[PDB]
Amino acid sequence: CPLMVKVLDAVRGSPAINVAVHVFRKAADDTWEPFASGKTSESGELHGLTTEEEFVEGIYKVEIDTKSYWKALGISPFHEHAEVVFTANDSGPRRYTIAALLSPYSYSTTAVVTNP
Amino acid sequence: CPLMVKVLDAVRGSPAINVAVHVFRKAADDTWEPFASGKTSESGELHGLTTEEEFVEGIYKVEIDTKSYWKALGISPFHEHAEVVFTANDSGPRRYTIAALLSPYSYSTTAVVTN
Amino acid sequence: CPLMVKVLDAVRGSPAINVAVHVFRKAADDTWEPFASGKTSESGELHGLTTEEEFVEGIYKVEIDTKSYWKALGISPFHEHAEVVFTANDSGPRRYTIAALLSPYSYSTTAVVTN
Amino acid sequence: CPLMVKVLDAVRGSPAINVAVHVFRKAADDTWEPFASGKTSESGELHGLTTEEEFVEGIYKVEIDTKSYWKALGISPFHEHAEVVFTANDSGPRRYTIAALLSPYSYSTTAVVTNP
Numbered sequence: 001c002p003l004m005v006k007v008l009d010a011v012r013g014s015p016a017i018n019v020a021v022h023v024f025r026k027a028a029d030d031t032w033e034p035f036a037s038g039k040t041s042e043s044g045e046l047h048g049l050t051t052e053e054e055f056v057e058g059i060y061k062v063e064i065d066t067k068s069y070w071k072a073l074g075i076s077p078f079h080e081h082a083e084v085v086f087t088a089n090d091s092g093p094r095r096y097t098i099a100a101l102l103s104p105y106s107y108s109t110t111a112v113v114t115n116p
Numbered sequence: 117c118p119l120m121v122k123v124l125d126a127v128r129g130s131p132a133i134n135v136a137v138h139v140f141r142k143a144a145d146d147t148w149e150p151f152a153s154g155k156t157s158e159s160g161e162l163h164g165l166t167t168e169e170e171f172v173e174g175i176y177k178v179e180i181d182t183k184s185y186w187k188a189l190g191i192s193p194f195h196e197h198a199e200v201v202f203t204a205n206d207s208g209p210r211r212y213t214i215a216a217l218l219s220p221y222s223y224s225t226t227a228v229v230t231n
Numbered sequence: 232c233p234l235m236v237k238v239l240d241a242v243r244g245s246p247a248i249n250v251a252v253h254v255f256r257k258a259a260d261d262t263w264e265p266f267a268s269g270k271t272s273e274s275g276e277l278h279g280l281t282t283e284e285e286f287v288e289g290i291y292k293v294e295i296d297t298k299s300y301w302k303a304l305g306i307s308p309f310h311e312h313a314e315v316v317f318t319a320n321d322s323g324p325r326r327y328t329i330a331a332l333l334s335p336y337s338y339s340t341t342a343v344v345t346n
Numbered sequence: 347c348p349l350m351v352k353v354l355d356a357v358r359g360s361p362a363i364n365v366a367v368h369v370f371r372k373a374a375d376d377t378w379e380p381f382a383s384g385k386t387s388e389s390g391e392l393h394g395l396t397t398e399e400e401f402v403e404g405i406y407k408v409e410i411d412t413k414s415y416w417k418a419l420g421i422s423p424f425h426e427h428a429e430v431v432f433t434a435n436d437s438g439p440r441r442y443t444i445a446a447l448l449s450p451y452s453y454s455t456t457a458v459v460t461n462p
């Protein structure tokens with residue numbers, strides 16, 4: 001699993017379940033091409049987005065759909081989504097975990113990058 | 117000052133100085149149109165971005181060029197930049213502070229919306 | 232103002248108002264001695280805690296009574312309070328801002344140390 | 347595992363390894379009695395601190411020794427440690443994960459509380 005996303009809810013003190021995530025990759029013409037998508041599980045985790053073969057060098061954008069999450073819970077949040085934009089695999093293949101902690105008016109994101 | 121941006125450095129415990137910040141307004145065809153920009157001050161703040169007349173309801177994106185900031189300090193960072201995307205709403209209070217706390221592999225952002 | 236405290240609310244996107252804050256100084260026998268206290272203002276800030284003469288080098292603890300803040304809003308929180316423990320050092324810059332961002336099950340804190 | 351601690355390093359983008367953690371429990375006389383301690387693994391995780399039988403109702407303090415961590419890496423950080431103080435198990439037994447994200451002048455902590 002070269003790319004995984006984990007999301008927590010800071011209001012409930014729980015995983016953030018059923019959060020939609022869309023991944024994009026910058027194309028040769030500088031536009032954002034759709035790359036993969038999914039939604040977090042009961043554990044707040046999203047596995048299986050991509051494969052080592054498919055996850056080549058590039059600039060990637062991980063869009064976490066925080067507004068749809070909070071709205072689905074009847075809350076009116078500030079942000080449209082959380083965007084995480086990074087260059088991947090430019091010193092060879094790595095494994096990336098993108099973690100996010102959500103509140104209605106705030107979010108934090110961190111990356112864990114390991115060499116397999 | 118309907119819109120202010122404040123950036124802090126979690127490695128040095130200081131304002132993040134001379135960081136470029138670009139604000140964009142989502143257009144009817146979903147593209148991002150330049151709206152305002154500047155560089156944070158010695159206190160990590162960027163004032164004077166817009167006026168109440170110009171800052172109408174809509175979706176806005178604040179892009180903070182974190183990568184150049186870290187490179188200038190000799191540190192290799194993870195993100196290309198930090199992005200804060202939000203809807204301005206006339207119902208709610210009238211002044212928006214977008215704050216961001218920067219680390220090489222992480223950032224946090226919060227909105228302080230007051231009258 | 233050698234020491235300032237600023238508290239923000241991540242659920243409502245606002246200053247955290249009327250929050251009690253207690254500062255303690257570690258004594259030679261390792262107990263925590265009351266040093267200064269107050270309540271955050273309408274802007275979430277507490278100024279005037281100490282003076283440069285009194286704020287000598289040493290270990291200090293800032294306790295933010297987050298539990299009462301959330302209960303007053305009708306929200307059940309996790310922490311008894313937030314604690315920020317640090318050494319004041321004359322070498323480094325002279326003004327300390329302790330900032331804290333509050334959620335029911337989480338908090339973040341950073342130090343902004345300037346001259 | 348009723349109590350687990352996970353620590354990440356926001357400068358390196360990695361687990362925070364070999365972080366000492368001391369847990370205390372408030373006694374009947376209002377003092378902090380030592381309850382359990384350990385250090386994080388190569389994965390940044392600390393398991394096996396306590397048992398369901400031992401982890402009774404009480405007010406607990408989890409002290410994460412961030413200064414010793416940063417100093418062991420030759421860095422001069424701001425905080426002495428990160429303290430996480432909470433009432434546990436007062437509506438029956440729960441499982442607690444205490445997570446922390448560290449920088450030299452900043453830290454964030456969140457709790458994940460589940461009912462087994």
Ligand SMILES: *[B@@H-]1OC(=O)c2cc(/C=C/c3ccc4c(c3)C(=O)O[B-]4(O)O)ccc21
Nearest residue numbers: 215216217224225226328330332339340341
């Ligand atoms: B994310 O995790 C954080 O700890 C954090 C902190 C902040 C912003 C704190 C802040 C806001 C406004 C002001 C200060 C600090 C300050 O020192 O002076 B101020 O201009 O009044 C944002 C996001 C995250």
Ligand SMILES: *[BH-]1OC(=O)c2cc(/C=C/c3ccc4c(c3)C(=O)O[B-]4(O)O)ccc21
Nearest residue numbers: 099100101108109110352445447454455456
């Ligand atoms: B920003 O401010 C935060 O407090 C924060 C917290 C996190 C969470 C990271 C995390 C917690 C638990 C677990 C992982 C990651 C993980 O990879 O596995 B796990 O043990 O289930 C992210 C960002 C921010």
